[PDB]
């Protein structure tokens with residue numbers, strides 16, 4: 314699968330659901346990061362674009378209470394790269410996952426209605 318960053322204007326950021334709909338409209342989905350190689354591919358997209366210091370929606374979304382986090386594309390949640398202390402469901406409203414687009418490439422759970430950049434896979 315091919316990944317593509319979407320870090321548009323400051324008023325072009327999207328909720329998790331709007332970002333998923335955008336990627337699905339292209340025939341793909343929000344990106345799942347399934348291993349270190351896919352993580353490095355995305356990091357290199359960030360360096361190539363110069364889109365540093367940005368947060369991006371990934372396909373991480375909470376399933377049932379039993380399952381916890383899932384990938385929107387159905388991939389197994391095997392590889393994980395949560396930031397230390399995450400996921401923390403801060404204030405009980407954080408059911409989607411974002412990438413901090415810095416060298417750590419770490420994940421954080423946040424409120425799905427937050428406006429973020431996003432990464433598609435196609």
Ligand SMILES: CO[C@H]1O[C@H](CO)[C@@H](O)[C@H](O)[C@H]1NC(C)=O
Pocket residue numbers: 399401403407421422423424427
């Ligand atoms: C203060 O909360 C923020 O930072 C913590 C980690 O310190 C994060 O866990 C938390 O998700 C994040 N919330 C938002 C809206 O970005």
Ligand SMILES: [Ca+2]
Pocket residue numbers: 399400401402403407421422423
């Ligand atoms: Ca969090």
